[PDB]
Every structure is written in C-alpha cells, then in structure tokens.
Amino acid sequence: MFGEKAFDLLKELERSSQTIPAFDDDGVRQVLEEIKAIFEENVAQASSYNASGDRSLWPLLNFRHAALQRNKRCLLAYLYERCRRIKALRWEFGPIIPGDIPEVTFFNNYSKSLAAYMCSAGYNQGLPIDLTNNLRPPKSLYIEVRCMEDYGKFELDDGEVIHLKKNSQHYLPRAQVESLVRQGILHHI
Amino acid sequence: PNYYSIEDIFVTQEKVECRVNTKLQRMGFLDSGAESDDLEPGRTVNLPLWYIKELKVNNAYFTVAVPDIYRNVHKAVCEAETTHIELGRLHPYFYEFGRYLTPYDRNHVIGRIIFETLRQRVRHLLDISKSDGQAAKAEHRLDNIEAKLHEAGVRTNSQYIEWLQMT
Amino acid sequence: MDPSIIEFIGEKCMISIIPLIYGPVGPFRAGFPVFVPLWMATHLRKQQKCRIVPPEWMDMDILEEIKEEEKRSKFFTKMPCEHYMVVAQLVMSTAPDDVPRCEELRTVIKDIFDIRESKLRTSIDAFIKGEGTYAKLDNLTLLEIHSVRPILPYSLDHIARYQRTATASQRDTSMLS
Amino acid sequence: FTQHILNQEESREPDDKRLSPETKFAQEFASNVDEYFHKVATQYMPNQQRGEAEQRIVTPNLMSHVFLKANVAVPAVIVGVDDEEVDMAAGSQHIIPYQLVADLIQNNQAQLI
Amino acid sequence: NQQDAQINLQAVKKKYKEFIRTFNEENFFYKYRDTLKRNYLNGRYFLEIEMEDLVGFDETLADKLNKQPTEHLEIFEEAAREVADEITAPRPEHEEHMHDIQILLSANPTNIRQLKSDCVSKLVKIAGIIVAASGISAKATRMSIQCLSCSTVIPNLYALKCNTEQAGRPKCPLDPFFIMPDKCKCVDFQTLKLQELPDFVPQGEIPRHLQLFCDRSLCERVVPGNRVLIQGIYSIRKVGKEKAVVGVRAPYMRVVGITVDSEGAGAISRYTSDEEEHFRRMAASGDIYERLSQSLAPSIFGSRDIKKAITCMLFGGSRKRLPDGLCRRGDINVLLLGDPGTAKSQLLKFVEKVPIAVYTSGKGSSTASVMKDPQTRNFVMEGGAMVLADGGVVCIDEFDKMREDDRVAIHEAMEQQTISIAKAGITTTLNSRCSVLAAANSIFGRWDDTKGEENIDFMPTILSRFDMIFIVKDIHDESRDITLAKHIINVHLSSNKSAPSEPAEGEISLSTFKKYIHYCRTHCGPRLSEAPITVRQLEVIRISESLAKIRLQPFATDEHVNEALRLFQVSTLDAAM
Numbered sequence A: 001m002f003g004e005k006a007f008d009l010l011k012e013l014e015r016s017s018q019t020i021p022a023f024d025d026d027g028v029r030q031v032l033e034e035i036k037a038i039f040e041e042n043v044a045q046a047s048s049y050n051a052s053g054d055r056s057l058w059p060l061l062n063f064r065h066a067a068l069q070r071n072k073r074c075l076l077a078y079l080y081e082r083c084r085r086i087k088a089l090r091w092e093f094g095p096i097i098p099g100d101i102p103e104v105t106f107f108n109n110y111s112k113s114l115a116a117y118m119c120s121a122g123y124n125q126g127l128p129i130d131l132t133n134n135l136r137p138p139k140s141l142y143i144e145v146r147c148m149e150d151y152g153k154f155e156l157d158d159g160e161v162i163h164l165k166k167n168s169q170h171y172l173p174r175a176q177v178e179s180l181v182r183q184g185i186l187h188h189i
Numbered sequence B: 001p002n003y004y005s006i007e008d009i010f011v012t013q014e015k016v017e018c019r020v021n022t023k024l025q026r027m028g029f030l031d032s033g034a035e036s037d038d039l040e041p042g043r044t045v046n047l048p049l050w051y052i053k054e055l056k057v058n059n060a061y062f063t064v065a066v067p068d069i070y071r072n073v074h075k076a077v078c079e080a081e082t083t084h085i086e087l088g089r090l091h092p093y094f095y096e097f098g099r100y101l102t103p104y105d106r107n108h109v110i111g112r113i114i115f116e117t118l119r120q121r122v123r124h125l126l127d128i129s130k131s132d133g134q135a136a137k138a139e140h141r142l143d144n145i146e147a148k149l150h151e152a153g154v155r156t157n158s159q160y161i162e163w164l165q166m167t
Numbered sequence C: 001m002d003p004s005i006i007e008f009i010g011e012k013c014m015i016s017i018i019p020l021i022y023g024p025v026g027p028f029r030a031g032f033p034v035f036v037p038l039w040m041a042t043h044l045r046k047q048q049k050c051r052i053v054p055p056e057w058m059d060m061d062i063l064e065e066i067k068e069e070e071k072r073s074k075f076f077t078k079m080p081c082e083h084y085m086v087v088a089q090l091v092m093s094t095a096p097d098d099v100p101r102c103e104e105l106r107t108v109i110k111d112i113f114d115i116r117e118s119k120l121r122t123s124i125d126a127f128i129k130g131e132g133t134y135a136k137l138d139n140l141t142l143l144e145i146h147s148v149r150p151i152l153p154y155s156l157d158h159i160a161r162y163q164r165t166a167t168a169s170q171r172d173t174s175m176l177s
Numbered sequence D: 001f002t003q004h005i006l007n008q009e010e011s012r013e014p015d016d017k018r019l020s021p022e023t024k025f026a027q028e029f030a031s032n033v034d035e036y037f038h039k040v041a042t043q044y045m046p047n048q049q050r051g052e053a054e055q056r057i058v059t060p061n062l063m064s065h066v067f068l069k070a071n072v073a074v075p076a077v078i079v080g081v082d083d084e085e086v087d088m089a090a091g092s093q094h095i096i097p098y099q100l101v102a103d104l105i106q107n108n109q110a111q112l113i
Numbered sequence E: 001n002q003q004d005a006q007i008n009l010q011a012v013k014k015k016y017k018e019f020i021r022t023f024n025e026e027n028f029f030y031k032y033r034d035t036l037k038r039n040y041l042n043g044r045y046f047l048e049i050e051m052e053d054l055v056g057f058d059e060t061l062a063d064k065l066n067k068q069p070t071e072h073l074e075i076f077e078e079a080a081r082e083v084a085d086e087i088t089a090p091r092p093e094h095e096e097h098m099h100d101i102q103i104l105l106s107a108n109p110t111n112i113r114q115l116k117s118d119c120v121s122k123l124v125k126i127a128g129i130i131v132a133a134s135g136i137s138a139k140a141t142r143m144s145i146q147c148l149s150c151s152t153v154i155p156n157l158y159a160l161k162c163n164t165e166q167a168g169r170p171k172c173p174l175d176p177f178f179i180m181p182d183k184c185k186c187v188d189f190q191t192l193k194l195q196e197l198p199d200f201v202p203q204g205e206i207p208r209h210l211q212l213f214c215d216r217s218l219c220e221r222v223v224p225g226n227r228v229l230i231q232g233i234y235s236i237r238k239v240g241k242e243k244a245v246v247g248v249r250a251p252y253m254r255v256v257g258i259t260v261d262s263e264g265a266g267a268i269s270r271y272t273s274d275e276e277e278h279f280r281r282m283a284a285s286g287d288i289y290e291r292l293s294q295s296l297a298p299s300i301f302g303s304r305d306i307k308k309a310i311t312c313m314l315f316g317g318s319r320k321r322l323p324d325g326l327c328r329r330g331d332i333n334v335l336l337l338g339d340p341g342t343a344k345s346q347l348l349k350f351v352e353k354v355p356i357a358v359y360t361s362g363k364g365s366s367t368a369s370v371m372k373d374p375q376t377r378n379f380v381m382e383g384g385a386m387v388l389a390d391g392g393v394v395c396i397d398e399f400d401k402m403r404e405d406d407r408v409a410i411h412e413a414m415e416q417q418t419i420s421i422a423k424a425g426i427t428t429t430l431n432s433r434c435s436v437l438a439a440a441n442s443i444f445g446r447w448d449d450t451k452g453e454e455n456i457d458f459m460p461t462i463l464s465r466f467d468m469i470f471i472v473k474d475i476h477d478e479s480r481d482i483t484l485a486k487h488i489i490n491v492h493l494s495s496n497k498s499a500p501s502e503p504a505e506g507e508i509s510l511s512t513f514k515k516y517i518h519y520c521r522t523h524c525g526p527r528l529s530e531a532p533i534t535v536r537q538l539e540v541i542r543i544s545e546s547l548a549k550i551r552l553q554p555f556a557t558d559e560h561v562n563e564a565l566r567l568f569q570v571s572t573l574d575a576a577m
C-alpha cells in the first residue's frame, strides 16, 4: 500500500530460472514515482511549527520513517535480488557470456571488485581463473562442439562461427570452447 | 534493519484493539478530522503495531491486552494441548509475535507460554525423518518460519540420497 | 555438508594395495604391495591395471562381533577407522569384481549404519531445557552428523534466543527470550 | 559483511593473520553502493543517517551452535569462556556457540568439525 | 517342530525376513525395507510388496504360498514385529512398545465367469465397477475370561471343561465363559461388494457379484462409482449336506492387495503458478464479457447476447451479510422457455461437463431418505440435493411436467433457503448456497410470452424471484431456416466435432476455465462504485457486483455494467405488458 508491492515482485522471474526468455526492469513506476511524491507529505511537517513540538508526529514519524524503511531494503533487492542468480551464472561464466538480454555501472564495479580475487587467483600476479568449466584433462586443441539448445548467442571466442545452440558445431579450437557448462550445453564434446 | 523477511511490513501490521488508559487525539487515517480529537479511555482502539512498537508500555497511554488466541484459553492449554494441537496457517505470526510482543504487553506471564509449544520439536520431529513421495502430500500446517527449515529438513536428506550412490 | 566433502577427505587416507611420484609413496613394482591413498585405485581398477584388498576391519567376524559389542554404547562404540561409509561405497563398487563376500558386508553396514542413527533420535529425544553444554561424540564415527548438521542448528538459534539466553541474560521473575 | 566490519578492521588494521590485501573490496563496496543508488533515491537522497548507516549488519549472530573437533586435552581442560565448559574430551564434546569460544581457534588448541 | 516339509517355521525361521534383507542392492536404495521407515514418518503401519520378486528370487515359493497365503501374511506380521523391533533400537536405548501393521501386495487380470472349485483358495486379478457397501464397525482377535484367564487365542479372522473348578472337588461344566472385553484387542471391517463387468453379457443375463471383507487400513479408501483391480480369496461361509435340495452354498471373497484405476482426466473429483499467469495475464485482456458469446455453444449458433448473461451467472454475486440477522440471496438464477427443436436439451446436456450438476427432469433425486437398510434395521438418511448443491448449481427442465408433491421445496429454497423437515418428529434444518438454470417446453411459446401472464396455472410467483427470462423460439427466418435445415446434416453426420472450438483465443479449455471460476469465486467481498424498473429488477444488483469478479476487480459502476440492464430488456419485453 505504502510499499507492500514486492508481493507483486514475486512472479517476474518465474520462467526465468534456467529457461529464461528475457527479463524486465518493469513495474517500477509509481512504486517509484510516489515515493518522494509522498516525501512532500513527509516534508509537510518536517520541522514544522504545526504543533510546536509535541507527541503528535512521533506516531506518524514512524509512518515517515517506516515508509522509507521498507522502500530501501526492498530496493536493495531490486538489484540484490537481481545480483544473486546473475552472479551465479556470472560464476558459471565470467564476462565471456554476459546476460542474454546504472546496473551495468554496478556490474562493471563488481567486475572491478572481483579483480582483487583475480589478482591472487592463478598466481600472485593474477588469472581470471577457471572455476566452472574444463574439468577436462586438456586433450588436442582443435575439435568441434555440441550443445543442448543454448540461447543468447554470445560466443565471441576465437572461432569461425559457432551459432551457440545444439549443433553450434564448426572447426572450433580450445581457445573458443572455454565458455559454458550447464546452461544447455554439455551432453557432449 | 532487522532479522529480515520478504514480508518485512507484514511484520508489525497485524492488528489488535487494545484499550486506552487515556483520551484520544486525531488518529488521522480514521474518521479523525475536524470531528473528534478526543474519546474515552477504552475503545475499539485498533493497533497495527509499527507506530507503538517502542512507545512506552510503562507510560500511561495504552493498556494490558491480548488477542484472545494469544490469551490463555488457547495458549495456556495449548501448552497442555501441546500434543497434537494444530496451527495450520491460521495465525502465521505465531512463532514471532511472541518473539516481540508478548513482553510488550507487560503481563509478566506469557513468554514462557510460547516455547513449551516449541519445546515439543525436540520430541516432534522424530516423526520428521524422511521423504517418501510427492512434492504435495500434507504441506499446509506450517508457520512462517518452520516451513523453511522443514524444506531444508527434506533438503539435506534429499541430497544425502545422492551421498549414497549414483542415485 | 555434501556427498563429496567426504570424498574430498576420506580417500586421502592410504592403504597397502597390490599393483616415482613424490610423496611417502615408494615407486611401483610388480608383485609388491604399495601403500597409496585411495584415489589411484580409482585410476587402476577402473583402468584395468590392478586389484586391491581392504583394511582389516573389512571382515564378517570382527564386526560380526561388534554387532553385540556396542550394546554397551549407551554413548558410543568401536570405530574401525571411522570411515566405513565411504570406502565401502567405492570398494564395494569395484572391489567385488574379484573380491569375495561383498554381501554380509553390505548387510552389516546398513545393519549398523541405519541403526546408530536410530539411537540418535533417542538420545536427541533426551535433550531438555536448552541442554546446550551436554553432547556426545564420545566414540563417534565420521560420516553421520552431517545428516543433522543443517537442521537443528539452523533451528536452535531461533530457539536459543530463549534456551541459551538464561546463563548470561535476565529479566523480571518470568523467563526471558 | 560489508556493513560494520569496517569498525572491526579499523580497530587495529589487523595484520597478515586476519585479513588480506579483503581490504581491496572495501573501496569497491561503498563505490558500487553509492553509484547504483545514484539512480535509486536521489531526488531527496538520505537525510540523517546519510553515510554508511548504523542499522545494516549482515551477521553478528554468534550463537550458531558449533561442533567441536576434539583433538586436544581430553580431561576437563577449562579455559576462558563465559558459558559452561565442563566435561571436556578428546573424543566427546559439549556442543557450544561461537562467541564465548572464540579463543581456542585463535589459539588453534581446539578445532572444528 | 515338523522338519520334513510344510515346515511351520521356515519363513520366520530365517527365510523371508532375510530375503527381505536380500532385497538389498547397490545405489543403496534397492529396498522394500525402509519403506516402513518412511511409514514411521507418520506411523501408517503398513507396507507394499510385489508378487514378482519372489519370481525374481526363485520359482519355488510362488506355487507354495498360494496354498496358505493368509497364514503367510500373519507370519509376515510376526516377521515385521520381530524385525523392525530390532530396528527400533540399535543398542539398548529404545523401545516404548511394539505394534502391528498390514502388508499390501502389488500384473495381469482375469474375469468372473470362469472361477470355481478348480481355482479355490487362489489369488486373482479381476475388475468391475463398485456399487455400495457398509461402514466400519468392529472386530478383535483376543481377550480373556474369568473362567480360565487365558488369552482368547483364535486362528481365524469353537466355544470350548469349565476351569472355575479346582477348589477341591467342585466342577462347574457346561461352559460359564463370560468374556471380559476390556482385556481385548481390536481390528476393522467394512464388508464390501461390487458388480461385475459392463461388457461381458450383463444384458441377456443378469450381473453376478461378490461379497468382501476389509481388515485394518483399507476402509475410508473407496466409494462407489469406481473401477478397480484386486486380489482376494475364493472362500465360502456355510457348512453342509428345504434350502439346499442337496447342498447349495453361497459366494464371497476377501480383500488383499487392491489396486484401483484412476482414469486420467476425470479425477479432479476425489484426488500451477504458470497456470495463474495463464489466468491473469489473459484476464488483463478486457475482452471476456462478450468475447465468450461464441463459447458455451462450441457447436451451436444463437443465445449469443444471452451467453453474455452467463458471464455473470456462475461467478455469482455476493452474500454481503450484515451486523443484524440476514443472509440474503447472493445466489442468482435464470429461466428460459420455448418449444422443442431449438436443441435446448443438448444445451443443458453439453453444459453438464461445463462445476457440479445433474440433468434429468420429471418422474426420474427430488427431500430426505428416511428409510431402512439391511443392517440391524437402521433408518439413516441421504439428505436432499441442496446437499449436493452448496456452491454447485443445476440445470433442470420440466417444472410443470413433474409431480406436485416436490414443489413445496421450491419456494422453500429459492426464496429464503427456509428448509426444514418433519418426517420423523424433527426439523433437520440444513441449508445451502444453491442456484439453478431452468428450462421448459411450457404452454404456447412467444404467442404467450410477449402478452400477459398465464403460463403456470398455480402461481405468478415464478416471474418474481428470477430475472433473466429470454425466449426460446423456432422463429421462421427463411434466410436462416435453410441454414438450420442444413445446420442439422453436419450434426447428423460423420462424428468429427470433438474439439473444433479448441483453436479459439480463450473460449475453451474446460479444465482451466472451471479452475478460473473456482479461484475467482473466492477472491474477496467485491462491490460496485458510487453509482418496469421496480424493486425486482434492481434486487440485477447481483450482476452489478458480478462485473467486479468478471473483470476480477473489486469495484465497478452502475451504467458501464448496465450491460446487464440492456440484456434484461430482452426479458422485460416478455412481461412488461
């Protein structure tokens, strides 16, 4: 009412678990466009002589204060809730394959924040370190690929053209094939 | 700013009608206006908690009071009837009302009433051991909190299932 | 807590086997036993390279004596290397390719595995009154306690608000959570 | 635990033993928390607890009942701790929480399971 | 101990218990074993098995147990109470007390017209369709008596020496055995019954049947109107040789290992959020009110703007009770009327599948069933059909062509729900949230309807309590008369039209629609907005509140939702004048 609205948030990610068509930043307008619309209500008596310092604004100070209090930490979620399983697939891959579809500034900040990890990782000097692919013992470097209906088509890795779904298969070397595991790919090598 | 929940304003929004030690003044969202800024001590005086969450029970503003499920007639014999008593989904804020409120009332009797319900878990979830079958058999007699670890209760065993073998 | 936290661990132990990498391991010689950690017999038996025989507790006599020994265990029992819920997993997978008596083996282990948990509710059906500083490992095994590790302890804090709170936190005459 | 770990890490700037060059994430913590918020609530952005505020803390609950790897003095080897610690053991244990026994594992006398 | 053959111990000696411990393979899940352990999740006190593991184990026991099965199963009771009670405790710290369980067996069926002495005391799979049966009364196995104070050890589920004697000389023969049932044990029963198949000449013959015996856990499981596969026993009840001109006897069987049929798509009767997206993200479209005017007739033309008035009907109005007494008529009804040939029969027949209803009219439920049964001559009732309609509603023809007896219960339900009985000296005052669709072939069609009021010769009351009465005709319209002359050869021929309406945007999917409704009619307490037209035109307000739940909204206004008014103008022209 005054922000009980995330009960509505709950459905946006429903298909979007491991069969994601696409995401929406949506539904956010009046849950946003009221919030400091109603600051004007919050400021109506903010340091006002309307009652000259008595009880009568403390019970609604709580309205003034709770109103924020819920807005923030839900609005933590709107990225944090969105940072979580995106970090997870962004663990499943680095920025080898970002999202199939100021969050980019926070992602770039998170990518710069992850640098610390990368510095010690692999060596003192640092390696974006393989954590999520090639438990392969490495074999000969130039043999092709197979998938299980991947989608997004971000394979930018050193190949002729792969067309990243099942039968994304061309003469693709090891440098190419270093992308993904469990987003519709690894029935096969 | 709490031990959070997704419903963090379905936290202190349950309503009770505890009486007034005092007269009234302009509840705002009510029929208050240029109509009434004063009533009696004691009235159907509705209390969605968040405004009175730290508003000095000790101070003469409002009264010792209970919602009658939280009164002894349920609770004090729900600790006697702590055997196959049901909670359903009926008043879900019932592990957690008393984690806040029941002291705030200031009748210095009711906190102990609670746990001896939840003391039963040390001899309840002997039955809770395992998962036979489907995802929906009897999954509707929960609180807002026990369900989570109950799912988790399944969960470690569900993947303890794969600890065994290829299964 | 996992299926393979143990297999991170338990296969690190070593035993003399039948068939140089640096380590206390010696080089490998035909006809000549060699103590190895158990994550090579993977890479031999499944590689169709060599066999292996078990430790000594692996028998149907010493632990067909334990079947009654632990009835002392109002607390706990004899623990032959503590890890017979993991090795037997992999041993009995592939060892019985030529090993005899893989059955009473398979019997007893479930006939001791499920059981010592069957007590475990019971001893846990003795916990009363926030009895946090009483517990039991006294001759515990290795591969059991994970199956309760996530459940009650991620319960008891939301209890121990009221259970463990007493011996440093106080209120008026009634009890405090 | 970006929240108030600054206070602990500002107590002594704990040396090689405690954190590591963990300190690099601190600079990125506020940066990503500020930049992002630059388009969250900025028309009338925070008013009294306007800095790294007081109320957000991730994990100060110290009572997460911990199992103890008994590898130590078996007998009732009693140590600095506020709750009961009677009846010590090299195999057994009396299960406990983290706060009061934050000592043995800084010592690494005692151990964890 | 008779250690030659028929050995009395073998099973519990080692064998079956240990085979069960041989039911033990890798994955560490191959078990018929911890089955009970997941029964001890609740204490169901039973277990399931096959008859094709013993075949996977041997070929020796399957022809053996068939001789003495009901002996083997209490041998298995013994096996269990010896086995799991070992498992109640690892080491000596657990047992409150033992208990007892049941076992469930289960492959390939049989029939009933082939089974006699040849296959007696043999376990069989057959199938029929259930009819009715008893409740659950009582049974026990053992107790004891003052006279000897020994447990009432019985084999089967005669009557004895006195033994209140040895007080010196005194005897006391001729059986002073006074049972002390507070010492006793206890079991269940149902005594069931079923009829044989509908395909194996039940027509030129008559259907034969079987009598049955339930034991512990298997009652409260099965209600008639069902089709089952079962195992039993071929036994009888009497003893022998002016009944029985020589020796005639009677048939029955037992219960063992029922396995029922759950045939597919009937059973949202007895036993997702993506579908909620389907509900609502379709509901967002403001195209449902008049969109479905081509829906409830998925094979018919007409009634179009009257299907417009079904859109409010099932969704109901609101039982907006008050601080004072009333529970007024939230429910709403309809009337239709006209001659045959308009397919108004099939309109109700096809509507049966489209929430809960029945479609019969006249001389062939009704009132109560205050009659007797066979069982110690009881008198117990069946209720009415406000019973069977308390959120369910009905579509029923031939008010006029039906007995005049069961017509005080029409005003005693449509007006007030003022229901009561006095058969035996009492008023069972049951109630229900019922409503009805009505049809008729009443007197003289539109020549009667438009003009005044003479349809039924007993009451003018039938125009008062209902509102939407739109005429059924076989109007002559020559441009469409030939169409309806050839709207009846496609119907007459070729058996094609099963799901021709399935492609429609959102005027199909029976299951999703019924669920659409049966969520919708449980949203809140919707209402409307600030916003001969007499008191029962108005008391339409139910339809006003309806469009809140038709748009699935809370609120709505008067005259956007006077769509209903403009549709009612169809009816009012009948009886304006």
Ligand SMILES: Nc1ncnc2c1ncn2[C@@H]1O[C@H](COP(=O)(O)OP(=O)(O)O)[C@@H](O)[C@H]1O
Residues within 6 Å of the ligand: E300, E301, E339, E340, E341, E342, E343, E344, E345, E346, E347, E441, E484, E487, E488, E491, E492
């Ligand atoms: N438009 C139509 N489409 C299909 N069948 C029709 C149509 N109009 C009439 N019929 C015929 O009407 C017959 C049914 O009449 P019925 O509904 O039984 O009359 P009543 O309802 O008075 O008993 C059906 O056999 C059907 O062939």
